[PDB]
């Protein structure tokens, strides 16, 4: 899933 949050 590319829409998962990629930030921290």
């Amino acid at each position, epitope marked *: 899933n*590319p829409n998962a949050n990629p930030n*921290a």
Partner: antibody
Amino acid sequence: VQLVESGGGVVQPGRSLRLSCAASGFTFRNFGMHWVRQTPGKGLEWVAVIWHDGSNKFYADSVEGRFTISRDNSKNMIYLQMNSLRVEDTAIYYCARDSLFYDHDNSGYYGYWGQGTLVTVSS
Amino acid sequence: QIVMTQSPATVSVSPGERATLSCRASRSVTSKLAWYQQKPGQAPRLLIYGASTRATGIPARFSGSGSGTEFTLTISSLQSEDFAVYFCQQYNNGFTFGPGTKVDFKR
């Protein structure tokens, strides 16, 4: 917040090229980054995304297997290596940061853009 | 992937008028949609995310509404600075942009 791309230019199809994007004025290791390209004809097209640590990566179907996105958190940089270039890859390539504020139910939009660099694939 | 359609292609507005721009989605994107402003030669600029939330530094005359498949960007009273192209972008399943809508000076 300042995002600056470079590395573009004119290249033959079938050849390769690497792009660079320096990031300033924010905590770089705490944000995922994107590559988005613009064409006069197909408009704005997302290219790839890299996690805040390089852990997970995702690519547009048009560039999967040929493009690879990378980042160095100690250099506050993000790179894009293009392989087996096609003329249809000619575009302006922008550097974009995910989110405006952090949120795990609000992500996937581009809060800050770079000026962009132009890749011209021509014989 | 998901297809964003924008209509119409060009809107003619006089300063002080209301401007409505429509964005439609192939499938529902819940409230995961953004709006961007782009002037010639410059990079895009974030206007509205989610579906209704303004970005930091965007005047109150920019208002976004919508859910699922039909969204609308509104400029309540257009001003000097708003003649540009406006793209919408969904981030529910993938990342796709609309074709854009030009807003020009009415004569």
